[PDB]
Amino acid sequence: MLKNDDFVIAKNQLGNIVPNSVGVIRAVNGKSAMVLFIGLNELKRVDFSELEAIDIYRTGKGYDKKICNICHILKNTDGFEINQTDAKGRKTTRPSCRECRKNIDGVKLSSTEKKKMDEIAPPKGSVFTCPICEKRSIVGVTANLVHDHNHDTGWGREWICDSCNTGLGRFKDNPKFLEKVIEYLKKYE
Amino acid sequence: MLKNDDFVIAKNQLGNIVPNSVGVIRAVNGKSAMVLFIGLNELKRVDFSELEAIDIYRTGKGYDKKICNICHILKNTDGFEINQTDAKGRKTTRPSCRECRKNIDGVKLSSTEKKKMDEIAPPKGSVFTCPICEKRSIVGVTANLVHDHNHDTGWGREWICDSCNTGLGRFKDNPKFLEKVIEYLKKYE
DNA sequence: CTCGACGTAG
DNA sequence: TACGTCGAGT
Ligand code: NA
Ligand code: NA
Ligand code: NA
Ligand SMILES: [Zn+2]
Ligand SMILES: [Zn+2]
Ligand SMILES: [Zn+2]
Ligand SMILES: [Zn+2]
């Protein structure tokens, strides 16, 4: 019935694995499967009766439920925050569920740190040079600026362009991943 | 009358500065201004008769002309590539004009390098781990993947997630700016 | 709720 | 033409 490479959810609790955790079948033994539960990267032996096959292509945009890209638990659409709109007018939700976004968002910029950054804000319509990408721009006209902050401490960093800020987040604001980017680029340079 | 911090365009060719180049007024005397032309970062003394005031807030989205974020020349809207759609259904163009995009895009992935990459493409619906961000995903379900390539050589790099690929571009695929990101983050550790 | 920006997909 | 994704602004 189940085949290698098929996707399943846990029907019930399986040790550390909560219900609705998505796994992929990695081996089959009679009516038991070795399942890689993707969120925790845990390979477990599971009886077929404890698993429910799912169709990954009937999840996400256009469907009732969506698989989170961090925890890889199948959740209702409302477990994800609306974030954008496509050309066809449909709403797009973040790929990470509200629970996983708590850890990505971390500590908010404090009120005193915000006021402090606001007192040195580049004026709208001024000529700005971003301290990261070094691009010159006209504030609010040829680039939009943001209050960047450290989400471990809640304290301010600098005024930077939105492009750079949304780049930092792709790499988790973490020098570990930036160093990985450098060695990746250098490898093919 | 022209005031410091006002914006102007060059009416005519001014040495290295082409017409319609945007500049900011940095000093004024009775007949001329010191103008910083933003694209080339060139500060010149220009007679008032060779400058025209420009309302920077009547450029870009919703208007017939737009100021490029690299060259900072005022161009027709059609000099910029349509790239996205907002929630109100209006089209958004790239901030960089078609001419400036040539340098950003560089050399395309060659046919032969593309075929090499396609030979080792992760299957749709497989479990993938991005070599940069180290995030696990289900291909085409919880993350979309791309052919990354070096745009100086046209040679392939690796299959990576779209999030990482679009992060590389924010930092110009250039270790210089990635090292700047690292120093910036460490400063506010 | 909304946003622009990136290199991709096609 | 179009796409999702990021930390933001609103
Ligand atoms: Na930030
Ligand atoms: Na306006
Ligand atoms: Na790339
Ligand atoms: Zn989650
Ligand atoms: Zn920047
Ligand atoms: Zn340009
Ligand atoms: Zn990645």
Determine the 3-state secondary structure of A175 from DSSP. helix
B165 touches strand C (CB under 7 A): yes
- Residues from chain A that touch B158, judged by Cβ atoms under 8 A, are 184
Q: Which two tokens stand for residue A64?
A: 């009732």
In single-letter form, the type of residue at position B139 comes to V
B33-71 burial, b at 16+ Cβ within 10 Å, e below that, comes to bbbbbbbbeeebebebebbeebebeebbeeeeebbbbbb
DSSP code per residue over B11-70: SS-BTTB-TTBEEEEEEE-SSEEEEEETTTTEEEEEEGGGEEE--GGGSSTTSSEEE-TT
> DSSP class of residue A78?
G
Closest nucleotide to A104, Cα to C1' = D7
Which element (helix H / strand E) includes B9?
Answer: strand B7-10
Report how far residue B65's alpha carbon sits from residue B97's, in angstroms, rounded to the nearest whole number: 11
Q: Are strands B32-37 and B42-47 parallel, antiparallel or unpaired?
A: antiparallel
Report how far residue A122's alpha carbon sits from residue B64's, in angstroms, rounded to the nearest whole number: 27
Strand C positions with any atom < 7 Å from protein CB?
1-9
Which chain B residue shows the shortest CA-CA distance from A83?
A: B87
Residue A74 in contact with residue A9, Cβ under 8 Å?
A: yes
- Residues from chain B that touch A135, judged by Cβ atoms under 8 A, are 69-70
Please state at what angle helix B162-170 crosses helix A162-170, rounded to 10 degrees: 140
Residue with the two structure tokens 């199948």:
A74
CB contact under 8 A, B182 and A179: yes
Report how far residue B1's alpha carbon sits from residue B104's, in angstroms, rounded to the nearest whole number: 38
- Residues from chain A that touch B131, judged by Cβ atoms under 8 A, are 180, 184
Q: In this structure, is the dihedral angle defined by the CA atoms of residues B14, B15, B18 and B24, taken in order, positive or negative?
A: negative
A68 labelled as ligand-binding?
Answer: yes
- Cα-to-centroid distance, A167 and ligand 1 (Å): 9
B29 labelled as ligand-binding?
Answer: no
Q: Please enumerate in sequence order all residues whose Cβ is within 8 A of that of B58, keeping only pairs 6 or more positions apart, or say none.
A: none
A61 touches strand D (CB under 7 A): yes
A98 touches strand D (CB under 7 A): no
Q: Please enumerate in sequence order all residues whose Cβ is within 8 A of that of A12, keeping only pairs 6 or more positions apart, or say none.
A: A19, A50
- Domains of chain B and any CATH numbers: 4-54 (2.30.30.140), 55-108 (3.30.60.130), 109-189 (3.40.1800.10)
Q: Could you give phi then psi for residue B154, rounded to 5 degrees?
A: 85, 10
**A33 vs A3, A29, A61, A64, CA distance in Å?**
9, 6, 29, 27
Q: Point out which residues pair with A45 in neighbouring strands.
A: A34
Q: Please enumerate in sequence order all residues whose Cβ is within 8 A of that of B119, keeping only pairs 6 or more positions apart, or say none.
A: none
A75 touches strand D (CB under 7 A): no
Reduced to 3 DSSP states, what percent helix, strand and coil does chain B have, rounded to the nearest 5? 25, 35, 40
Burial of A165 (0-12, 13-18, 19+ CB in 10 A): buried
Q: Could you give phi then psi for residue B89, rounded to 5 degrees?
A: 85, 5
Residue B149 in contact with residue B109, Cβ under 8 Å?
A: yes
Determine the 3-state secondary structure of B103 from DSSP. helix
Technique behind the model: X-ray
Residue A32 in contact with residue A48, Cβ under 8 Å?
A: yes
